[PDB]
Design a protein around this ligand. Structure first.
Ligand code: CLA
Ligand code: CLA
Ligand code: CLA
Ligand code: CLA
Ligand code: CLA
Ligand code: CLA
Ligand SMILES: CC1=C(/C=C/C(C)=C/C=C/C(C)=C/C=C/C=C(C)/C=C/C=C(C)/C=C/C2=C(C)C(=O)CCC2(C)C)C(C)(C)CCC1=O
Ligand SMILES: CC1=C(/C=C/C(C)=C/C=C/C(C)=C/C=C/C=C(C)/C=C/C=C(C)/C=C/C2=C(C)CCCC2(C)C)C(C)(C)CCC1
Ligand SMILES: CC1=C(/C=C/C(C)=C/C=CC(/C)=C/C=C/C=C(C)/C=C/C=C(C)/C=C/C2=C(C)CCCC2(C)C)C(C)(C)CCC1
Ligand SMILES: CC1=C(/C=C/C(C)=C/C=CC(/C)=C/C=C/C=C(C)/C=C/C=C(C)/C=C/C2=C(C)CCCC2(C)C)C(C)(C)CCC1
Ligand SMILES: CC1=C(/C=C/C(C)=C\C=C\C(C)=C\C=C\C=C(C)\C=C\C=C(C)/C=C/C2=C(C)CCCC2(C)C)C(C)(C)CCC1
Ligand SMILES: CC(C)=CCC/C(C)=C\CC/C(C)=C\CC/C(C)=C/CC1=C(C)C(=O)c2ccccc2C1=O
Lengths: 103, 31, 75, 154, 31, 73, 154, 154, 103, 31, 31
């Protein structure tokens, strides 16, 4: 609904925490990390807890870009996944690429 | 002494100001 | 008070707080030696509680507690 | 089953404290969330409940309360002081609501600044009235808490 | 000897437990 | 001594839990801050600790140096 | 001539109870029909008229009234009882008005649910104020209905 | 320097009575001009200030005031008479404000007829409340203007 | 105004009653009967009273379909008019035929 | 006597009318 | 004594809360 994924990305299985999005994600900005995994495996959330991601393309909305870039260094340092791309989602629905800005 | 004082309060004080307010409505509202 | 004389003093159901009573009804539903208006019990519970062996208001109170918690258990 | 989330990314949990239907009925029909109400009536009902309870601690616990004081002649000063105390606490709450309103709110109510000023106004009248109504029932608790008809003659 | 206010308060604590369980049963019967 | 010993990031993380508690409390998330609650800054934590240390120092000694000398008799 | 019908299929009769022009000026400038009024003010004025008259039967006819009671110490209890009685009748009317408002009104007023809640809030404040104002004039009708200046000295 | 005009056809002068920034901060944040306020709350705050000071001349200067009358037996009559006097002066102001509203206002406020009726309503409740509040603090000025704790025992 | 006949139908002479239309005709539905008379003749209203129909096509607005059908059966049983058409009138002014359906 | 008469006022007079108002809200609002 | 107690109530209680509300308006309203 208010946190809809782009088409092609499927949600990882997470049971919901209290450390996630707050009212800023509705009114100022939120962020989206989108990566590609070869299997289903278990990763620590940057906001607390653990989640399971599936094979294919996985997207996650976070309040904060350092939460996304901390998730990205976790995927590199544990699961060798380097195709995370980080978007800044505005509340009107605009999406801009902010990592990799080089490509 | 046979007096109704509340009636003096009604029609010498309250009712004339009532009547001027009603006449103000009669003379100041269009249609 | 009813165990001391079961044949004279009448069983009492509960007491009355109705603000509509005048003075005649306030003194009418008050017994002799009572400090206010009550309902005189006509259901035989004192005779029940005597024959099943309740002798104190504290046993009636633990019966009340046990039935509230047994109702709480059934809900 | 009991702890779900719907939106798993939003930092919240759907829990029996949150998501059972009688608390949602109570909260969604508490005045600030009750549908079909102008903000003024919402603040008025919130004020009346609050100003009614705010009389109590000031009259039982305040500087004029004891049985060691001077007759129940001090009791009327106690009720009057507690009434003024509850009204000025409502006035401070009104000041709080209207300083919230006059700088321009951004909030999940769809009140404007004008809507929160309607709420502030209703809060003030309802709170001072709840203080006055609690004071009048406290004055009347003598005949309220006994059968008054019965000691009085005729 | 009758029952004082503290034991009536204990009975009200017990009735609050009963009232909570009744309030849960009535709403889940309403589903 | 609280501001002097305990420093910032504790209080910032604590205020983040308080921010979550306010935005998920019904009848109260409808009241919003205009300025975001953060912890006080590092220099501000030192200064508020110094100001309290200093105010307490001066009032403690002023109370002593007046009442012990006025209570000689 | 006097019993016209203008829309003869609508089941109505335009009669001089209906279609006298001073009766239309009276009814159409009663507060609910008076043009240019926000519904809160209409409720306020309806409340003040109702709460002023509602004090009276409770103080003359209620359970504390008689000359065979205990001095005029009981008359303060009578005025207080009638005051609380008229305010609680206004509270019941407010509850009625806002149960009408909260369920979604469909009526000849152009009020919403929010407009009827504004009317309910005005009704409550006006009715309690009219009860209080009738109680204060009934605290004052001793000196009001005599020449009070004249029996006092100096 | 001090007196400019900034539209010299318009018959006005821009003067440090007119155009000093704290005077503009004062006048522009008096409640009739303070931004973000519904007209009812503007009326409410205007009424509370006015009705609070309106109790004073009637109690100090009215027909029941002196030290050569009958004890402070007449003092309660003085407080009640001044209270009723200030509420009826507020009622006359309400009548004035709502006769202004109901005939259709053209003014530099962006109030409607409905907005001026909200102002009239808030004026009445705030004014009568300010009268009642000034009466309660006038009843409380004995204990307010002394250290009350200290003469009472225990 | 709010109760306007179709063009071609003239109103019968009736001094208007209290058995007629209520707020439902404003807000939910009402019904309209049109018949053809050869002369001016006196008929009982279904809502109480008596009216006179003029020569031509007469239209009448009623709250219920049974009032219109009882008026039509009274016109058959007394004055031999069998071309009454009963319509259902919505508050927006959309018109549909409901008697006869077959023709 | 051993009466809580304020409780009689709450649960026999206030709370029934409370309950009928709440049930009116249950039976007269669409969804 | 030679005291104006109402002045103590104004300038030590009412006027500082007044002043903090005025500075709140000064530091929170945009333009
Ligand atoms: C928390 C500690 C505490 C407590 C319990 C008290 C209590 C009291 N003080 Mg006090 N005081 C304190 C700290 C405290 N003080 C401090 C730090 C100072 C500064 C030095 C003072 C200085 C002071 C002075 C000068 C005076 C008092 C006085 C009083 C008495 C009355 C005051 C009053 O009515 O307030 C009003 C209370 C309220 C407006 C509301 C109270 C809060 C409510 C009940 C909380 C309810 C929450 C609810 C249960 C939960 C929500 C329910 C919902 C979910 C359904 C009272 C017994 C007065 C007195 O006469 O002493 C006997 C007095 O003159 N105090
Ligand atoms: C870093 C320090 C800091 C600073 C300078 C501020 C400063 C400010 N805040 Mg913030 N805030 C902070 C941290 C801070 N806050 C934290 C950690 C939280 C929790 C996450 C909040 C959450 C918050 C909210 C929701 C709001 C503010 C608001 C404000 C502004 C007004 C202050 C106020 O409301 O009075 C508060 C007074 C107290 C806390 C004292 C409590 C005294 C008790 C309640 C007795 C008072 C009696 C009174 C009459 C209540 C009794 C009635 C009641 C029982 C119903 C102000 C500029 C408001 C705003 O933005 O204005 C538009 C606002 O809505 N703040
Ligand atoms: C209709 C028959 C009737 C009448 C006239 C009364 C009258 C009275 N009862 Mg009563 N009662 C009744 C039936 C009646 N009762 C029934 C059926 C019961 C149930 C068993 C009771 C049980 C009862 C109790 C327990 C008590 C009374 C009491 C009273 C007295 C005061 C109560 C009061 O102020 O109400 C309030 C009245 C109003 C809020 C308004 C009254 C209606 C107004 C005046 C109508 C005005 C219309 C207007 C003229 C026309 C419109 C004008 C416009 C077009 C301009 C009063 C004399 C009390 C008492 O002490 O007895 C002396 C008392 O304690 N009654
Ligand atoms: C013919 C003219 C006239 C007369 C005879 C009076 C007579 C009186 N006035 Mg008054 N007044 C007048 C014109 C007049 N006024 C005008 C033109 C204004 C400006 C609009 C005022 C504004 C005014 C205020 C603000 C007050 C009075 C008060 C009084 C009473 C003070 C004597 C007393 O009992 O000590 C008793 C002293 C007190 C009870 C004061 C206690 C401390 C107070 C409550 C602190 C708060 C006061 C503060 C300034 C108001 C809030 C400001 C707001 C912006 C927050 C007295 C009855 C006082 C009063 O009404 O008592 C209830 C008072 O507070 N007058
Ligand atoms: C202007 C001349 C004047 C003055 C000063 C008075 C004064 C008084 N008359 Mg009086 N009277 C007058 C003319 C006057 N009268 C006339 C022409 C008649 C008709 C024949 C009467 C007939 C009369 C009667 C029958 C009575 C009085 C009485 C009184 C006393 C109290 C009445 C009262 O409270 O009013 C109410 C006052 C107000 C509502 C407010 C007063 C105005 C305020 C203070 C102005 C404030 C402006 C402010 C300072 C500036 C703005 C400030 C802002 C910029 C910050 C009082 C001392 C009564 C009495 O008992 O005598 C002792 C009495 O019964 N008079
Ligand atoms: C269920 C049976 C029942 C019945 C018919 C009564 C009846 C009565 N009680 Mg009692 N009460 C009960 C249970 C009951 N009570 C229990 C279990 C307790 C211990 C917590 C009490 C505690 C109590 C006190 C302290 C007082 C009364 C008093 C009274 C009298 C006035 C009403 C009142 O305000 O009390 C209010 C009662 C409560 C707030 C708690 C009651 C809790 C019960 C169990 C809830 C009932 C739910 C019921 C089973 C569901 C039926 C639904 C049905 C309508 C479809 C009245 C005659 C007053 C009195 O003595 O009269 C002079 C009084 O002061 N009751
Ligand atoms: C905690 C605390 C205190 C206590 C304060 C309190 C708050 C004391 C408690 C006061 C109360 C009011 C307890 C409520 C008892 C209500 C009960 C048992 C209801 C039964 C309803 C039933 C069976 C329903 C049947 C129903 C079913 C199931 C349906 O399905 C639908 C129909 C129906 C609804 C009829 C004290 C101060 C006293 C002591 C200190 C302390 O800590
Ligand atoms: C301009 C200025 C000035 C002046 C000022 C003045 C003029 C003053 C004042 C003052 C005033 C004039 C004040 C007041 C006040 C008030 C108040 C504070 C009130 C109140 C109230 C209340 C609270 C009420 C309530 C209520 C209600 C409403 C309802 C019911 C009833 C009751 C009672 C509860 C000067 C130059 C000096 C300085 C500068 C500024
Ligand atoms: C949640 C809940 C709970 C709780 C509750 C509570 C918390 C309580 C309470 C309570 C309260 C807290 C109540 C209250 C109230 C009130 C009232 C009833 C009021 C009033 C008022 C009035 C009536 C006023 C009036 C007026 C005005 C406004 C104007 C002028 C003045 C006067 C005075 C007239 C429980 C758990 C138990 C159960 C479940 C639910
Ligand atoms: C139809 C008609 C008639 C009748 C009439 C009647 C029925 C009467 C009446 C009357 C009435 C029935 C009146 C009244 C009134 C009133 C008033 C005047 C009120 C008031 C008030 C007030 C002022 C309040 C205030 C307040 C408030 C609001 C808040 C706070 C509190 C207080 C208190 C402050 C006749 C045939 C004869 C003639 C013609 C017309
Ligand atoms: C309270 C009450 C009531 C109710 C009741 C019920 C409903 C119930 C119950 C019940 C009960 C109160 C019970 C009980 C019981 C007991 C028991 C049950 C015991 C014991 C013990 C033992 C020690 C045992 C042992 C053994 C075993 C282990 C097994 C078998 C064998 C032998 C012997 C070895 C009534 C209404 C009547 C009346 C009043 C109140
Ligand atoms: C406009 C205005 C000022 C209104 C008044 C606003 C209102 C209602 C109360 C005034 C605020 C109050 C009372 C507290 C908030 C201060 C706060 C964030 C303290 C936590 C904190 C502590 C305890 C430390 O030790 C520390 C050490 C080193 C660095 C940072 C910190 C730190 O952050």
């Amino acid at each position: 609904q208010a946190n809809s994924l782009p088409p092609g990305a499927s949600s990882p299985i997470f049971g919901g925490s209290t450390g996630g999005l707050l009212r800023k994600a509705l009114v100022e900005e939120k962020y989206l990390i989108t990566w590609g995994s070869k299997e289903e495996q278990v990763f620590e959330m940057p906001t607390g807890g653990a989640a399971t991601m599936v094979a294919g393309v996985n997207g996650l909305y976070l309040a904060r870009k350092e939460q996304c870039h901390a998730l990205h260094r976790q995927l590199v340092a544990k699961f060798k996944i380097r195709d995370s791309k980080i978007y800044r989602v505005l509340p009107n629905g605009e999406q801009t690429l902010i990592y990799p800005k080089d490509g | 002494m046979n007096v109704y004082p509340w009636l003096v309060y009604v029609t010498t004080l309250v009712f004339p100001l009532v009547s001027l307010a009603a006449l103000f409505i009669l003379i100041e509202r269009d249609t | 008070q009813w165990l001391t004389d079961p044949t004279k003093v009448k069983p009492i159901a509960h007491a009355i707080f109705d603000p509509h009573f005048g003075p005649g009804a306030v003194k009418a539903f008050t017994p002799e030696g009572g400090s206010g208006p009550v309902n005189i019990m006509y259901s035989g519970l004192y005779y029940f509680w005597y024959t099943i062996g309740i002798r104190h208001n504290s046993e009636l109170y633990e019966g009340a507690i046990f039935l509230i918690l047994l109702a709480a258990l059934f809900l | 089953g009991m702890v779900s989330t719907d939106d798993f990314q939003v930092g919240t949990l759907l829990t029996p404290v949150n998501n059972s239907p009688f608390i949602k009925f109570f909260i969604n029909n508490l005045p600030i969330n009750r549908p079909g109400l102008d903000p003024f009536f919402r603040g008025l009902e919130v004020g009346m409940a609050h100003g009614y309870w705010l009389f109590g601690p000031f009259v039982v616990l305040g500087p004029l309360r004891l049985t060691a004081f001077r007759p129940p002649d001090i009791e009327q000063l106690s009720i009057l002081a507690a009434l003024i105390s509850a009204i000025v606490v409502v006035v401070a709450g009104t000041l709080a609501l209207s300083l919230y309103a006059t700088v321009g709110p951004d909030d999940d109510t769809k009140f404007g600044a004008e809507g929160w000023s309607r709420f502030a106004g209703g809060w003030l009248i309802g709170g001072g009235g709840g203080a006055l109504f609690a004071a009048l029932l406290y004055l009347f608790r003598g005949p309220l808490l006994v059968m008054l008809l019965g000691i009085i003659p005729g | 000897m009758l029952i004082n206010n503290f034991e009536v308060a204990g009975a009200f604590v017990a009735a609050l437990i009963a009232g909570f369980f009744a309030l849960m049963l009535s709403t889940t019967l309403g589903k | 001594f609280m501001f002097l010993i305990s420093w910032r990031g504790y209080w910032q993380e604590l205020i983040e839990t308080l921010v979550w508690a306010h935005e998920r409390t019904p009848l109260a998330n409808l009241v919003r801050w205009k300025d975001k609650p953060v912890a006080m800054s590092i220099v501000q934590g030192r200064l508020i600790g110094l100001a309290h240390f200093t105010v307490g120092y001066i009032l403690t000694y002023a109370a002593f140096v007046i009442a012990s000398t006025a209570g000689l008799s």
